[PDB]
């Protein structure tokens, strides 16, 4: 789901 991509990105720049 395209609408879930930004959530995933958020967790990325938040982890490392």
């Amino acid at each position, epitope marked *: *789901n*395209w*609408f*879930d*991509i*930004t*959530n995933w*990105l*958020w967790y990325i*720049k938040k982890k490392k």
Partner: antibody
Amino acid sequence: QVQLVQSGAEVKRPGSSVTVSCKASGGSFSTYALSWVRQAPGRGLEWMGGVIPLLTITNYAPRFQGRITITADRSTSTAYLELNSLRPEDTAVYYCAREGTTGWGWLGKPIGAFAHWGQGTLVTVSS
Amino acid sequence: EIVLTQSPGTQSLSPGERATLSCRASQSVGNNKLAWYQQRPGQAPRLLIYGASSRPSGVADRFSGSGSGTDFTLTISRLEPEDFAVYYCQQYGQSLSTFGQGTKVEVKR
């Protein structure tokens, strides 16, 4: 505070192409999803598609796939909607909308739903 | 494509009364990604509920969302004068997002 400001109303001839802009200020621009929703006079809201600037990844509703182009300029935090081969049925108010976020500030976790809306741009297709 | 049905399309109610608006999906909405918006004449839509039941800060708590799967409901505990407007549901459980046709809550007299 996240604010979206759209370009002014426009009259376009049948068969032409229209470009509407949406400038964002406040919060992050590259990692949040921006969509375009239109509403014909007296009708309901219709999601047309969206874009995620950072990945330049677009998502278009099948109904507009082939007639629409959504782009984002990270240098000016501006998103654009281009709709081609205009017909009278395309006369409507076009809104840009950005997903909201959780907690305080505006750099929190994205919620998908459209929390922020532009003022709308009336596009009139006529001769 | 998930078709969202909002029936009835209009509800005539009195100020102070409770209101429950239905949104039925043609198929299960992934992860309950269902939102509700309010729209008054000449104004842009305003987000009221997201994720079926979450209410963003600033939205009056007399508005609540419930349901899951293909059966969702927006409840307005007590109608204030400014609550008479149009309400749209939207699903974003899959890449192709869709809106219901909207329900107009008007004043009965």
